[PDB]
JSON list of C-alpha atoms and ligand atoms in Angstrom, two decimals:
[
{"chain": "Z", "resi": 432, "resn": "UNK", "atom": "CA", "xyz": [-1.86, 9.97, 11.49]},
{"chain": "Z", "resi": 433, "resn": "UNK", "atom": "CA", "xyz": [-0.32, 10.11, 14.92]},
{"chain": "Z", "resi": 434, "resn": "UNK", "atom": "CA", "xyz": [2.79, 9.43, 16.47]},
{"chain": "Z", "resi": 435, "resn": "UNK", "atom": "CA", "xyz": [4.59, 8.67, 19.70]},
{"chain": "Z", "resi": 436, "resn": "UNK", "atom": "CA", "xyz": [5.33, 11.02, 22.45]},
{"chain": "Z", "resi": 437, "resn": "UNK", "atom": "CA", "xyz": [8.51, 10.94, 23.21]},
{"chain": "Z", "resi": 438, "resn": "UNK", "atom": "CA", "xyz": [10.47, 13.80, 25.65]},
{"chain": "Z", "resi": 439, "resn": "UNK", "atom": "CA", "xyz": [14.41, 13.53, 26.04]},
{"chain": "Z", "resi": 440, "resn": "UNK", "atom": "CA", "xyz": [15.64, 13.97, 29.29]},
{"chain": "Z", "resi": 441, "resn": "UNK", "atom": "CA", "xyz": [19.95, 14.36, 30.10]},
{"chain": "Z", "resi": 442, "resn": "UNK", "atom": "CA", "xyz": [21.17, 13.48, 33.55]},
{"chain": "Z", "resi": 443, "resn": "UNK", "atom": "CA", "xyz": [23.99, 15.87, 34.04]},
{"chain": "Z", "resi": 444, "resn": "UNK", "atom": "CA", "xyz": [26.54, 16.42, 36.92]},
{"chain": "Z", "resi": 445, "resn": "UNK", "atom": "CA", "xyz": [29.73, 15.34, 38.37]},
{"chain": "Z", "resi": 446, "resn": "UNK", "atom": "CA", "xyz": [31.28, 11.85, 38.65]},
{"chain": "Z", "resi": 447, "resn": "UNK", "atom": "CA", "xyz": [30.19, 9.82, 41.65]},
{"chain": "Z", "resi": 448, "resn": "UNK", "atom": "CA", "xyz": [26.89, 11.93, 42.22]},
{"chain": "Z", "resi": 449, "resn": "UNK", "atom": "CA", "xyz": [25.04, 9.06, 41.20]},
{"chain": "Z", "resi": 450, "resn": "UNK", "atom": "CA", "xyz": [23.79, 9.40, 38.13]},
{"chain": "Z", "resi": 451, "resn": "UNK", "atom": "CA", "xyz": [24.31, 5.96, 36.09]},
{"chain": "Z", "resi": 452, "resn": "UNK", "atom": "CA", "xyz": [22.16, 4.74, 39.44]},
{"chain": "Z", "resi": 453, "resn": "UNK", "atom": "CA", "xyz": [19.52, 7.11, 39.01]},
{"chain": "Z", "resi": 454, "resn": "UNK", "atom": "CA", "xyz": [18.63, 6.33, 35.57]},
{"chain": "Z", "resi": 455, "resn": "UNK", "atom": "CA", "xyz": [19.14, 2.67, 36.13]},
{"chain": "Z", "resi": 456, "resn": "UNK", "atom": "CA", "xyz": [16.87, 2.71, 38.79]},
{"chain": "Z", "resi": 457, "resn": "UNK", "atom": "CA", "xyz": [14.31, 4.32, 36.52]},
{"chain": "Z", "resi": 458, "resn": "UNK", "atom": "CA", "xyz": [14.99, 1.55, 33.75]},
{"chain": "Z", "resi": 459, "resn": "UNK", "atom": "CA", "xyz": [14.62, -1.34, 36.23]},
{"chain": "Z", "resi": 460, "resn": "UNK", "atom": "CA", "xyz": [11.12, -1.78, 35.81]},
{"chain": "Z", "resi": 461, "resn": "UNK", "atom": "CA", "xyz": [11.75, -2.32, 31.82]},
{"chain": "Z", "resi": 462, "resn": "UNK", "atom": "CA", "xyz": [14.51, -4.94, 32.31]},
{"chain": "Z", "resi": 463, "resn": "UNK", "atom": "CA", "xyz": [14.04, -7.63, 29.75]},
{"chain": "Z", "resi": 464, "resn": "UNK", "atom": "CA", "xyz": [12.93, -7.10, 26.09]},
{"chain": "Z", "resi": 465, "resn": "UNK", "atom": "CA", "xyz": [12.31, -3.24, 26.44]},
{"chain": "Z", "resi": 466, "resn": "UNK", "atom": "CA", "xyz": [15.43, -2.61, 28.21]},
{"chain": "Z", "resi": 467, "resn": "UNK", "atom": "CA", "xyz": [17.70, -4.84, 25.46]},
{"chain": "Z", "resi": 468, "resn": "UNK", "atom": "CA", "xyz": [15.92, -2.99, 22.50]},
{"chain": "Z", "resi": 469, "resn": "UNK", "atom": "CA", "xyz": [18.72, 0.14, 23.19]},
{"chain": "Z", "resi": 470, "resn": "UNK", "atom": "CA", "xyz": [21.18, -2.06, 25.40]},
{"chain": "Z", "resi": 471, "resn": "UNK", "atom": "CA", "xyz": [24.91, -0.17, 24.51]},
{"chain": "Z", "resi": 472, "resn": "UNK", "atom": "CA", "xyz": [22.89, 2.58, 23.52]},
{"chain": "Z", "resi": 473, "resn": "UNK", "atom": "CA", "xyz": [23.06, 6.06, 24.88]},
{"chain": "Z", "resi": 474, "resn": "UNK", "atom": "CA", "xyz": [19.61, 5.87, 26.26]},
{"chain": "Z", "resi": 475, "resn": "UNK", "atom": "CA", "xyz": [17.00, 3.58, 27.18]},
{"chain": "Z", "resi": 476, "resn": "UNK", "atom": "CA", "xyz": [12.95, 4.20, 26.69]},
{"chain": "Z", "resi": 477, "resn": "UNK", "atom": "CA", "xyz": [10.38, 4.39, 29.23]},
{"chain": "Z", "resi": 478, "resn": "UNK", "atom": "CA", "xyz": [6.86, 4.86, 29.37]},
{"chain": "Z", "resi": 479, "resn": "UNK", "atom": "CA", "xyz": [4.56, 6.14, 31.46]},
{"chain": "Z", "resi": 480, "resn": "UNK", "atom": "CA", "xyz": [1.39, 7.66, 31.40]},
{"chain": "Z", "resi": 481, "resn": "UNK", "atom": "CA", "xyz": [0.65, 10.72, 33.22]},
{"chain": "Z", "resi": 482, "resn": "UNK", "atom": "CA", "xyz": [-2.72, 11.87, 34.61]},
{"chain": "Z", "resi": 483, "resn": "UNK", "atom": "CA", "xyz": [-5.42, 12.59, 32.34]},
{"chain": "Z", "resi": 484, "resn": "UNK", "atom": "CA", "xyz": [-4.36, 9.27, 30.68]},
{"chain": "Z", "resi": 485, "resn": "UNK", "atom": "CA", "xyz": [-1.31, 10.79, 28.59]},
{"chain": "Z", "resi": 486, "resn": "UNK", "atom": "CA", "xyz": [1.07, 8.61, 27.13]},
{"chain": "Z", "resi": 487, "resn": "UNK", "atom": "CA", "xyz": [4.42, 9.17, 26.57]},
{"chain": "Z", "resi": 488, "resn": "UNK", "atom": "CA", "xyz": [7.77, 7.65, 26.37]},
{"chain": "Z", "resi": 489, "resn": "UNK", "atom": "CA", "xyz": [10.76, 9.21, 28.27]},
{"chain": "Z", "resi": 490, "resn": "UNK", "atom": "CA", "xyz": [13.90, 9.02, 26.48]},
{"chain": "Z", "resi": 491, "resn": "UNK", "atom": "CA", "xyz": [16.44, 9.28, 29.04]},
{"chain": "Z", "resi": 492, "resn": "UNK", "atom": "CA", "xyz": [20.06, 9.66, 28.48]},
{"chain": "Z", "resi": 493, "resn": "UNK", "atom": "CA", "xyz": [23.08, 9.28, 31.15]},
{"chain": "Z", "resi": 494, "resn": "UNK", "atom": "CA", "xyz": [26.24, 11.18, 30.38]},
{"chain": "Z", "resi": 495, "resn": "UNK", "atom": "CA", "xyz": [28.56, 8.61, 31.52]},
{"chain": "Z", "resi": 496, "resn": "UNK", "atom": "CA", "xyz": [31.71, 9.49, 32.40]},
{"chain": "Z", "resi": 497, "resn": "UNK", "atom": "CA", "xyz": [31.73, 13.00, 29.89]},
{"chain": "Z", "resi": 498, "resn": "UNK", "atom": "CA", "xyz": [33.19, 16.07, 31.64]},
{"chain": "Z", "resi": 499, "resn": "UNK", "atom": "CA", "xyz": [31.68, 19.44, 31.27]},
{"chain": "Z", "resi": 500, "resn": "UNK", "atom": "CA", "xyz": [33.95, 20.25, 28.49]},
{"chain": "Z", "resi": 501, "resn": "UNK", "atom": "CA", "xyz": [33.54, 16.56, 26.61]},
{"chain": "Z", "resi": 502, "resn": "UNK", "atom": "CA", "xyz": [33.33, 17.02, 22.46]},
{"chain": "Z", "resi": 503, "resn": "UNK", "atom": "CA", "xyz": [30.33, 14.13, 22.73]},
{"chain": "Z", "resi": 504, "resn": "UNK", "atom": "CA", "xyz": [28.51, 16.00, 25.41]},
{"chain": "Z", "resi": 505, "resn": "UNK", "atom": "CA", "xyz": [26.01, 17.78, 22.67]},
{"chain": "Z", "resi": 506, "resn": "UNK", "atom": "CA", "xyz": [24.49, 15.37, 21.68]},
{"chain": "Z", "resi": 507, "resn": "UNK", "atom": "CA", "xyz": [23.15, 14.46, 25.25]},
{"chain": "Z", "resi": 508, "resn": "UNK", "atom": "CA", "xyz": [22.04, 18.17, 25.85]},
{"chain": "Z", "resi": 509, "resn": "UNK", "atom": "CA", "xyz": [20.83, 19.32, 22.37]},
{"chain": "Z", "resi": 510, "resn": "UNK", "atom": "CA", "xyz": [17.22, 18.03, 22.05]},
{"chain": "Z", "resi": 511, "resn": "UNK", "atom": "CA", "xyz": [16.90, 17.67, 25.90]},
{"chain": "Z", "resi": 512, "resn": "UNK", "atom": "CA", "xyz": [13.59, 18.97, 27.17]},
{"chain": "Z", "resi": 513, "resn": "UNK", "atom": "CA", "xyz": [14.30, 17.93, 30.71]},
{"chain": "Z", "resi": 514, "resn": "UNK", "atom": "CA", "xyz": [17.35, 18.11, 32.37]},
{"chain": "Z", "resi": 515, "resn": "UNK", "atom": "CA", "xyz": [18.25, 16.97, 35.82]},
{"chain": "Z", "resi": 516, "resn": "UNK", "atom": "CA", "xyz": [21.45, 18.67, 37.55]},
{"chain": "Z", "resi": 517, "resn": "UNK", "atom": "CA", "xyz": [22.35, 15.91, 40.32]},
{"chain": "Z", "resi": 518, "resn": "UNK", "atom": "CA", "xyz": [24.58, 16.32, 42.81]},
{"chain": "Z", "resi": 519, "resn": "UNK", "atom": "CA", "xyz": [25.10, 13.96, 45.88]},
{"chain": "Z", "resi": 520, "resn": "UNK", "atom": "CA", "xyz": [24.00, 15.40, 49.01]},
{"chain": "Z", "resi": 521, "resn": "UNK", "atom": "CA", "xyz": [27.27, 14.60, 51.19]},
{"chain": "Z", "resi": 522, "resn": "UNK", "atom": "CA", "xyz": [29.64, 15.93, 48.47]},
{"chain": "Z", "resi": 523, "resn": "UNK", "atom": "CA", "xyz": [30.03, 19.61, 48.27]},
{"chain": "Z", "resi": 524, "resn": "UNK", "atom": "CA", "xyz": [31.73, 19.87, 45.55]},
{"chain": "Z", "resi": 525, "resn": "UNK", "atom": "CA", "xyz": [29.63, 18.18, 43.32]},
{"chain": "Z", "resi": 526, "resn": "UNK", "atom": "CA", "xyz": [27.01, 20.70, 44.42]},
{"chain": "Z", "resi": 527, "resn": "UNK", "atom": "CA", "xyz": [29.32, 23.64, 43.54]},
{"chain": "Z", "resi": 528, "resn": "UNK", "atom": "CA", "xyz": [30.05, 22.32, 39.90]},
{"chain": "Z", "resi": 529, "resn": "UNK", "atom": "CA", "xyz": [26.30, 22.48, 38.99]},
{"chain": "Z", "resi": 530, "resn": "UNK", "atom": "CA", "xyz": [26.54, 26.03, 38.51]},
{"chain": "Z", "resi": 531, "resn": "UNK", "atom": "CA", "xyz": [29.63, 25.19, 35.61]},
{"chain": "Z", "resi": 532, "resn": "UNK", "atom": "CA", "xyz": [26.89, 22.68, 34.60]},
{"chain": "Z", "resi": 533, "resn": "UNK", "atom": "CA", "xyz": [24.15, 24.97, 34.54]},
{"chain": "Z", "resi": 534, "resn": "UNK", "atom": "CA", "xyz": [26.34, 27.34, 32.30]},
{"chain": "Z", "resi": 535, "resn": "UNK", "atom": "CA", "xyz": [26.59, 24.47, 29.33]},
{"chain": "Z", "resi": 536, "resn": "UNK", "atom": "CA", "xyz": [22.33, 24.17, 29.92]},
{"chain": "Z", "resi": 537, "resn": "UNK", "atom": "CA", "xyz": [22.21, 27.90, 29.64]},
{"chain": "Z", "resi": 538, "resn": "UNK", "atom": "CA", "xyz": [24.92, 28.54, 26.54]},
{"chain": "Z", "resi": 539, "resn": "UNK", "atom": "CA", "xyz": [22.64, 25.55, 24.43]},
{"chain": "Z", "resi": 540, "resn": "UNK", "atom": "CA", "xyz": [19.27, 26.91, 25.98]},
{"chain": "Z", "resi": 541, "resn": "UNK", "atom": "CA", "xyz": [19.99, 30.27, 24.45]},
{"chain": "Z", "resi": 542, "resn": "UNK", "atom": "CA", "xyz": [21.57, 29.10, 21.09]},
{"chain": "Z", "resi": 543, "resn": "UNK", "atom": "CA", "xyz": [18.58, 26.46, 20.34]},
{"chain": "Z", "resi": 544, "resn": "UNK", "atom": "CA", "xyz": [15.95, 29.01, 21.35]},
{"chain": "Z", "resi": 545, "resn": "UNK", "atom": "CA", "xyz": [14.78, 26.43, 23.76]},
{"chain": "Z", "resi": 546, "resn": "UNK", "atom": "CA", "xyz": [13.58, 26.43, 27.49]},
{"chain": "Z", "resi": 547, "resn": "UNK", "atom": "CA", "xyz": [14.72, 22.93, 29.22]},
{"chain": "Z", "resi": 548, "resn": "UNK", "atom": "CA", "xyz": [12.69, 21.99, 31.99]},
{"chain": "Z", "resi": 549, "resn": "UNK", "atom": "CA", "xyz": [15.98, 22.11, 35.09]},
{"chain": "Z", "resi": 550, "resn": "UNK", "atom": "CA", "xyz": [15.48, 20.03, 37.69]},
{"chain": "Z", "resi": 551, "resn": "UNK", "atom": "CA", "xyz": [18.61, 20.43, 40.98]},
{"chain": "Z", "resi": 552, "resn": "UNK", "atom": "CA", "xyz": [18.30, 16.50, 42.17]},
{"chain": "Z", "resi": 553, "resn": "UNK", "atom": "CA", "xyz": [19.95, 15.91, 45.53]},
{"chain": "Z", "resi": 554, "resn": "UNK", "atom": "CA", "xyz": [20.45, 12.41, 46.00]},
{"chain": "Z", "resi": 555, "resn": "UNK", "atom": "CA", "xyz": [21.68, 10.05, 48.38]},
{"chain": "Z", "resi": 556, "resn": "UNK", "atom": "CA", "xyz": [18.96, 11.35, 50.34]},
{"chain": "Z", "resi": 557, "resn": "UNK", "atom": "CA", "xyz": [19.35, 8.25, 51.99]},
{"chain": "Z", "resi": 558, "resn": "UNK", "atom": "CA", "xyz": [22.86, 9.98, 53.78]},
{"chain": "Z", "resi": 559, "resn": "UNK", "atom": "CA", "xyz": [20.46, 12.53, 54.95]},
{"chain": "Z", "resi": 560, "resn": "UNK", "atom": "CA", "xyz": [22.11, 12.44, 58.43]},
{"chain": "Z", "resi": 561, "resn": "UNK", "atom": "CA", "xyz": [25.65, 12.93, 57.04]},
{"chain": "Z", "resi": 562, "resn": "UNK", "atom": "CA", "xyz": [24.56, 15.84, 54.47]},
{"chain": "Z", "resi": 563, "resn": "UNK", "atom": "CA", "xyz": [27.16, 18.41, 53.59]},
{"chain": "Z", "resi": 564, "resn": "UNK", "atom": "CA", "xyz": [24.47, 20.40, 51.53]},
{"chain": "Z", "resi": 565, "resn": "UNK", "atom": "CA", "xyz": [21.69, 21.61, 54.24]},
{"chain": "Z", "resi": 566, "resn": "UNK", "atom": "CA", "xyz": [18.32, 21.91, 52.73]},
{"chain": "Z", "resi": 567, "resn": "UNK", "atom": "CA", "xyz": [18.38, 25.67, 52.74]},
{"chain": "Z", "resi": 568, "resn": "UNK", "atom": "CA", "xyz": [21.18, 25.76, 50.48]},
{"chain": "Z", "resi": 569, "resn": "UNK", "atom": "CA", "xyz": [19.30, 23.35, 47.64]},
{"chain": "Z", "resi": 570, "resn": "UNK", "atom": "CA", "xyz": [16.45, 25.46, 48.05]},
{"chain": "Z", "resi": 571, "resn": "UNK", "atom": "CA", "xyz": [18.56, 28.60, 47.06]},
{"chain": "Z", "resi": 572, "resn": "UNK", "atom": "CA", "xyz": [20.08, 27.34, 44.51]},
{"chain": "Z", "resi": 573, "resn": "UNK", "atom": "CA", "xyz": [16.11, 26.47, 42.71]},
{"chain": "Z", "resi": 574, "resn": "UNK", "atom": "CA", "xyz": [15.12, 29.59, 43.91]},
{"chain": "Z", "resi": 575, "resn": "UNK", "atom": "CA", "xyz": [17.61, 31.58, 42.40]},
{"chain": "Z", "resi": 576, "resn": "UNK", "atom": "CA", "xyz": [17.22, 29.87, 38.65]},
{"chain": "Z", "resi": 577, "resn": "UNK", "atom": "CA", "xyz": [13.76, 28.09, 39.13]},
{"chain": "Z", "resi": 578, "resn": "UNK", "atom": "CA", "xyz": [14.56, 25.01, 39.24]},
{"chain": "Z", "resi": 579, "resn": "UNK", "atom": "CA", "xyz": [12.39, 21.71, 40.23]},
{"chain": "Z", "resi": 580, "resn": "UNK", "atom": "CA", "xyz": [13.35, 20.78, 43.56]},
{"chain": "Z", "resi": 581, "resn": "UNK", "atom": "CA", "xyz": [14.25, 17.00, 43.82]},
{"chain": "Z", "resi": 582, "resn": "UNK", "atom": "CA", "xyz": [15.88, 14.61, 47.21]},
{"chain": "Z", "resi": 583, "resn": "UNK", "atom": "CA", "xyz": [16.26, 11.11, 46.00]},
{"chain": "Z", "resi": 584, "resn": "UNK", "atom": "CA", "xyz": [17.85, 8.23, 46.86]},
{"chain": "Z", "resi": 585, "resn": "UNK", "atom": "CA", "xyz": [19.25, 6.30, 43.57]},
{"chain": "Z", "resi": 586, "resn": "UNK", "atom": "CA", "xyz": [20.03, 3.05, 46.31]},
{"chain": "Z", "resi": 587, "resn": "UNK", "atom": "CA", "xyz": [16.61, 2.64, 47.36]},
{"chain": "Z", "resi": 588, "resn": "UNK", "atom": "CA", "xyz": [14.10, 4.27, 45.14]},
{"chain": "Z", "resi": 589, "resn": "UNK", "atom": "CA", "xyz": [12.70, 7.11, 47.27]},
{"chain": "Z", "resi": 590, "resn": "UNK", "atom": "CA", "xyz": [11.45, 9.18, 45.13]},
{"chain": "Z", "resi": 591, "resn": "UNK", "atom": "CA", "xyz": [13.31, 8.20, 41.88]},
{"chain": "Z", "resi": 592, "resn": "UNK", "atom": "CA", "xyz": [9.75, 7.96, 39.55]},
{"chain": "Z", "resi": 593, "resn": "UNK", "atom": "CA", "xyz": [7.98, 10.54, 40.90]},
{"chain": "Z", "resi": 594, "resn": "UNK", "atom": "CA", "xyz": [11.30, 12.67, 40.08]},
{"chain": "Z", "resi": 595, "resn": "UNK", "atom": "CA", "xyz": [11.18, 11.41, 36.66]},
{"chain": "Z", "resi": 596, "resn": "UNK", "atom": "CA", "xyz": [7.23, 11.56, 36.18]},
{"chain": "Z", "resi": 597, "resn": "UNK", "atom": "CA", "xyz": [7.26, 15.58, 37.54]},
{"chain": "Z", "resi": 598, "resn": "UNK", "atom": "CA", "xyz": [10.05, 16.44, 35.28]},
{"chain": "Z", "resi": 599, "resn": "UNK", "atom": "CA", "xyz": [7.94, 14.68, 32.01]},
{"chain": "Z", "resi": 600, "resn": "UNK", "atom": "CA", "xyz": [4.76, 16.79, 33.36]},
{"chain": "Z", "resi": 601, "resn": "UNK", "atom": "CA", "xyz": [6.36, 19.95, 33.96]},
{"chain": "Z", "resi": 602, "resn": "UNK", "atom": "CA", "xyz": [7.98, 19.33, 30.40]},
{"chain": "Z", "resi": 603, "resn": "UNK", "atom": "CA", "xyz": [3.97, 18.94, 28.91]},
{"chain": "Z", "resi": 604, "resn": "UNK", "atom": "CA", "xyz": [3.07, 22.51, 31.13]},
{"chain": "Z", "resi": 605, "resn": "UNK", "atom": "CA", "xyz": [1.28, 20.19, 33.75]},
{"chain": "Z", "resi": 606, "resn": "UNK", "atom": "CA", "xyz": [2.14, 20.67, 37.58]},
{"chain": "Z", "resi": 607, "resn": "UNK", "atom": "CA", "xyz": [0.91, 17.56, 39.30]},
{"chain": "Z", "resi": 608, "resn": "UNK", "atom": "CA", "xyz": [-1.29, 17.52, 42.17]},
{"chain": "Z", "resi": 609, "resn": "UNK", "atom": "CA", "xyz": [-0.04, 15.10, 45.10]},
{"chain": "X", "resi": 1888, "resn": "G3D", "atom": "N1", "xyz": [24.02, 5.70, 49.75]},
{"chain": "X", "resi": 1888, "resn": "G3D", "atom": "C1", "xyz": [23.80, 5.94, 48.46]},
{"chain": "X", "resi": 1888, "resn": "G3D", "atom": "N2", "xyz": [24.78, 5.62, 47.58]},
{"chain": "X", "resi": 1888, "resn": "G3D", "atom": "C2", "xyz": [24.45, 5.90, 46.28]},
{"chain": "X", "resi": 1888, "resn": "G3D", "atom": "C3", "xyz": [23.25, 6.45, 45.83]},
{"chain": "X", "resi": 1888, "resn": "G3D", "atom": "N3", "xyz": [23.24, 6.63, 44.47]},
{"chain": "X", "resi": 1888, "resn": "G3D", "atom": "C4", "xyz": [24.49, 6.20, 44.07]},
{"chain": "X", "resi": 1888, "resn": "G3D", "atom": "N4", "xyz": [25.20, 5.73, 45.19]},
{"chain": "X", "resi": 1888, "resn": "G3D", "atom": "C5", "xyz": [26.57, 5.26, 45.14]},
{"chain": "X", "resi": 1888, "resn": "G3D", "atom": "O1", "xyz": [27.38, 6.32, 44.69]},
{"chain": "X", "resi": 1888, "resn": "G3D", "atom": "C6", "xyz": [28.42, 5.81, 43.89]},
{"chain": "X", "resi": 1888, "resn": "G3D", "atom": "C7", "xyz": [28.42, 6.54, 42.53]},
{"chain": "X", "resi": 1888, "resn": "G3D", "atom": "O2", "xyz": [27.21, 6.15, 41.81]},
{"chain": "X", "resi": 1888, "resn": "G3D", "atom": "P1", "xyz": [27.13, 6.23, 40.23]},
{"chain": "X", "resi": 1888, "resn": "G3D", "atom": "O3", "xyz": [25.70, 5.93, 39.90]},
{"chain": "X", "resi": 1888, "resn": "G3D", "atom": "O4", "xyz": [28.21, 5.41, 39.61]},
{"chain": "X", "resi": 1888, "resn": "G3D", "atom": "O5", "xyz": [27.47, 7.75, 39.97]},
{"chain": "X", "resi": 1888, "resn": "G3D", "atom": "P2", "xyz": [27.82, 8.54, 38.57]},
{"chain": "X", "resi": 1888, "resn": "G3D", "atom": "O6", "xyz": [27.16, 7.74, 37.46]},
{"chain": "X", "resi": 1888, "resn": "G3D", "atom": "O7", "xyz": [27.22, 9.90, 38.79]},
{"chain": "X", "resi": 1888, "resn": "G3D", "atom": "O8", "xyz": [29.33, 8.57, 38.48]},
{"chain": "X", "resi": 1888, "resn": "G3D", "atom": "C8", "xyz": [28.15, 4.36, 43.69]},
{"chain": "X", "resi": 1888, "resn": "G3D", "atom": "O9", "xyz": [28.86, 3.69, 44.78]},
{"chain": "X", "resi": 1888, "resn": "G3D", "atom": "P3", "xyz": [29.73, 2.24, 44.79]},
{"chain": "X", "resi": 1888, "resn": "G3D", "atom": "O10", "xyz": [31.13, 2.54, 44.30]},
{"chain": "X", "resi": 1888, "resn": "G3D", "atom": "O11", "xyz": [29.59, 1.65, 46.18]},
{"chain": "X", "resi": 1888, "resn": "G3D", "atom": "O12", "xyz": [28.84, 1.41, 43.91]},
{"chain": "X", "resi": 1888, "resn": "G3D", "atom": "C9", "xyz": [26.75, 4.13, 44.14]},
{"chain": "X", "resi": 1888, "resn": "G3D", "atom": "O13", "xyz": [26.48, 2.90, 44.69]},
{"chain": "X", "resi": 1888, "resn": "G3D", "atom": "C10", "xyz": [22.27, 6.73, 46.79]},
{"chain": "X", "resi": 1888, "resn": "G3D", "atom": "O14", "xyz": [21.09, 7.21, 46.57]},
{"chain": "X", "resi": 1888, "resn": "G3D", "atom": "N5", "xyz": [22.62, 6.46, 48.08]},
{"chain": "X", "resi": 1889, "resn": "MG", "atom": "MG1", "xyz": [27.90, 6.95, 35.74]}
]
């Protein structure tokens, strides 16, 4: 026998960073009987197939409006083989709070034995010119706890899929070649 593919991925991070834009942007191209199958669900299914004709489905969930200390919040992050800390690029604070973020990724990384693939997602890339978060300071950040380096813009697409599609690689051990 053989089964699906399937890899979970939680979109974590403060209110207003963008996040229910992110994922919807992802979902868009599903929109009609794919997209209603998990409609009031907690996530929605995707797939794609990566080079070296790989198929799998990306499960991917978006918090909502759960703070870090939400009682539902575990059962977003438990499971999650991908995670993607997004902050908006012309909010500070939303940048600073990843670090209280990353804490909750680390505390259930450690206790399920596991080793999520992090992803630091700037978006709003789009607000590049208004930016309270210079590029430098993202690039830190990954350096300092190896983290996949993402700029996005939820509004118009740049580089939404290929954030999504890296993460699902990098989740398989595969660093894509572009
Ligand atoms: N310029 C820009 N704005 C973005 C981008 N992504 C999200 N936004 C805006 O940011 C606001 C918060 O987005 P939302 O997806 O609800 O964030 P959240 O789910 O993290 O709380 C929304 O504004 P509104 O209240 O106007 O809808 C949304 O339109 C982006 O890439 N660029
Ligand atoms: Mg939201």
């Amino acid at each position: 026998g053989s089964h699906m593919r399937q890899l979970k991925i939680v979109v974590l991070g403060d209110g207003a960073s963008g996040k229910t834009s992110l994922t919807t942007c992802f979902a868009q191209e599903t929109f009609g009987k794919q997209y209603k199958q998990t409609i009031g669900l907690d996530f929605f299914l995707r797939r794609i197939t990566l080079p070296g004709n790989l198929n799998v489905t990306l499960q991917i969930w978006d918090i909502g409006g759960q703070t870090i200390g939400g009682k539902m919040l575990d059962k977003y992050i438990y499971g999650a083989q991908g995670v993607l800390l997004v902050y908006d690029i012309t909010n500070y604070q939303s940048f600073e709070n990843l670090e209280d973020w990353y804490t909750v990724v680390k505390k259930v990384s450690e206790e399920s034995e596991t080793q999520p693939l992090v992803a630091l997602v700037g978006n709003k890339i789009d607000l590049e010119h208004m930016r309270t978060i210079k590029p430098e300071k993202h690039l830190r950040f990954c350096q300092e706890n190896g983290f996949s380096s993402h700029f996005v813009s939820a509004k118009t697409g740049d580089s939404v899929f290929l954030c999504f599609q890296k993460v699902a690689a990098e989740i398989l051990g595969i660093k894509l070649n572009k």
